[PDB]
């Protein structure tokens, strides 16, 4: 199969902005490669073909160029309507293929996550389970490591992690770790912790508890 | 053959 | 106009196959490609294989040629791709399109051995003894989606953060956060409101000081 690799992962920035994103193939594919757009919740939509060719009514700050194996998708001034996930795609040789994708993002100052820590509720504590949870909320950007320990080791399975899309209105994610036990062994231990790694410090943040 | 947008735009 | 239609949602049980349909209008179905997409949210693109209704001449990716099909109901303008021992790797969002320019809106395929299951709804209050307060709401072993999670019944809706669900052996979690002034609460009330349509439940579960 043929190798697409996009560059760079995502690119954050202001409107009014130009930007310049990379497709480079494993083999030449001449001049059949295509450029969609993804909003979220969203059907991809079919932006440039054949390298260069806009589709009509695709606004005309996009435009594709390069050949060969390298090629490059150009917004000339962003527009907020145009943040979400951009990939290329192969037609030179089937199976067609696609790059793993370059996410346009809005730029905002960066923001620590205010973190809180939720022990199991009395009332999932009647039953057989028990989940501590942790919210990471409102931070920039959206690159984040949460560790959970328990009596100062990590553990990572029975761990579920959920992301919020970037928010509309002020440009900061936030995300949802949920640690599940069973309640037996919840009551085996005592210390709970959520431990948050991000950009904005050198030092984790920190939330803990102690059953 | 295929032709990528060609449904849409010849 | 040209339409492609496909269902929203499909559930199945692993091992069990299932045909999901792409109904074509609005245009000479015998003169187009009809391609399928897969995609698992969050992640890329795949080409899963073409059949070009003039003669039901096939093209599938390798990788799927043990696990998709592609038939058609030429009579009715429908396009079928059946998938054979499903299992929670084939739970994903799956696209017809022509030639990559008219799309489908997706049918998500979700593979999960559970019946309608209505979701256990959990406070959660702040740490025991621990200016603002962030409290949640956890929604934890319910199938199918959606849920419909409110706060208050819908009049408190700023400083919420109602994250997507994930499933996880067979049942989904989610989880809201809201984050109020420490004067707003526990002084005056906040419940979480949670209702699943597939199992005809409504519940309330008021976030309540621990003790």
């Known amino acids: 199969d043929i190798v697409l690799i996009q560059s760079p992962a995502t690119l954050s920035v202001t409107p009014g902005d130009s930007v310049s994103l990379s497709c480079r193939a494993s083999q030449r594919i001449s001049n059949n490669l295509h450029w969609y ?29 390069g050949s060969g194996t390298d090629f490059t998708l150009s917004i000339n001034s962003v527009e907020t309507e145009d943040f979400g996930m951009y990939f290329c795609q192969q037609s030179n040789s089937w199976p067609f ?29 009647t039953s057989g389970g028990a989940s501590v949870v942790c919210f990471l909320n409102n931070f920039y950007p959206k690159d984040i490591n949460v560790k959970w320990k328990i009596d100062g080791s990590e553990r990572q399975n029975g761990v579920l992690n959920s992301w ?8 900061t994610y936030s995300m949802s770790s949920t640690l599940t036990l069973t309640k037996d062994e919840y009551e085996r231990h005592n210390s709970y912790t959520c431990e948050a790694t991000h950009k904005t410090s050198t030092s984790p943040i920190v939330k803990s508890f102690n059953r | 053959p295929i032709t990528i947008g060609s449904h849409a735009h010849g | 106009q040209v339409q492609l239609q496909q269902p929203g949602a499909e559930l199945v049980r692993p091992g069990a196959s299932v045909k999901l349909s792409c109904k074509a209008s609005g245009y000479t179905f015998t003169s187009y490609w009809m391609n399928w997409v897969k995609q698992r949210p969050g992640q890329g693109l795949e080409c899963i294989g073409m059949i070009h209704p003039s ?23 429908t396009a079928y791709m059946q998938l054979s021992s499903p299992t929670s790797e084939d739970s994903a969002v799956y696209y017809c399109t022509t030639h990559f320019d008219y799309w489908g809106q997706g049918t998500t395929l ?25 409290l949640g709401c956890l929604v934890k072993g319910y199938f199918p989606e959606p849920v419909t999670l409110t706060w208050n019944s819908g009049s408190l809706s700023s400083g919420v953060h109602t994250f997507p669900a994930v ?24 419940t979480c409101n949670v209702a699943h349509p597939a199992s005809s439940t ?10």
């Open chain 1, 37 to 65: 757009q993804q909003k979220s919740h969203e059907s991809p939509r079919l932006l440039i073909r054949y390298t260069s060719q806009s589709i009509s009514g695709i606004p005309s700050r996009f435009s594709g160029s």
């Open chain 1, 97 to 125: 293929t696609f790059g793993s994708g370059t996410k346009l993002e809005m730029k905002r100052a960066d923001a620590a996550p205010t973190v809180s820590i939720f022990p199991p509720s009395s009332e999932q504590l």
């Open chain 1, 164 to 171: 919020t899309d970037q928010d509309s209105k002020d440009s």
């Open chain 3, 55 to 77: 003669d039901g001449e096939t093209r599938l990716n390798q990788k799927f040629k043990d696990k998709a099909t592609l038939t058609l109901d030429k009579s009715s303008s």
């Open chain 3, 110 to 134: 979700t593979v999960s051995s559970a019946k309608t299951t209505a979701p256990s709804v959990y406070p959660l209050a702040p740490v025991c003894g621990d200016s603002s307060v962030t």
């Open chain 3, 167 to 190: 499933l996880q052996s067979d049942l989904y979690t989610l989880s809201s956060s809201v984050t109020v002034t420490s004067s707003t609460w526990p002084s005056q009330s906040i």
């Open chain 3, 202 to 211: 409504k519940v309330d579960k008021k976030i309540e000081p621990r003790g």
